[PDB]
């Protein structure tokens, strides 16, 4: 319908919903929703407001976060209470990098951790790293059966 489907509370609300699904880390439901909305919105121009959740998803799917974080700065234009979700998603990203960087490389200067995790603060760092149990050295963090038996084992496995 033209009359029934109009209300802009749609345009903001749907996007809100998708973003919810991301917030809960439910990917299955999310992409399912994509497939849903597609045939309806199929008149779809780019994604007008809706690129915020979509694009927000694609960039973290690929693994390039900086663009994603940028989107988190770009929700303020249309801003609504998803700021809370922001504070969700924001944390939801950082562990990732953390959970990434744990295996990345063992050795970081504190300024670099600030660079990665998008802190505006130096102390929030070791707050996080303690919360992450990371032993910290002065700005610089570190991220870290006899054979006889075996033989008889092979035997007893053979002669059953």
């Amino acid at each position: 319908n033209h009359k029934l489907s109009e209300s802009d509370k749609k345009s903001k609300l749907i996007s809100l919903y998708l973003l919810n699904l991301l917030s809960q880390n439910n990917t299955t439901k999310f992409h399912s929703e994509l497939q849903y909305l597609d045939k309806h919105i199929k008149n779809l121009e780019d994604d007008s407001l809706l690129s915020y959740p979509i694009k927000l998803d694609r960039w973290l799917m690929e693994g390039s976060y900086q663009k994603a974080w940028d989107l988190l700065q770009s929700g303020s234009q249309n801003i609504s209470e998803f700021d809370s979700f922001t504070d969700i998603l924001k944390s939801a990203i950082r562990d990732e990098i953390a959970k990434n960087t744990e295996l990345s490389y063992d050795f970081l200067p504190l300024s670099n951790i600030k660079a990665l995790l998008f802190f505006n603060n130096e102390k929030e760092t070791e707050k996080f790293a303690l919360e992450r149990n990371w032993p910290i050295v002065n700005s610089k963090v570190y991220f870290n059966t006899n054979i006889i038996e075996k033989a008889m084992d092979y035997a007893i496995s053979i002669e059953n």
């Binding site: 390039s64 295996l103 990345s104």
Partner: peptide, 10 residues
């Protein structure tokens, strides 16, 4: 990069 590669490693 190091975001993408740091990801690939994990």
């Amino acid at each position: 990069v190091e975001y993408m590669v740091s990801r690939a490693i994990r």
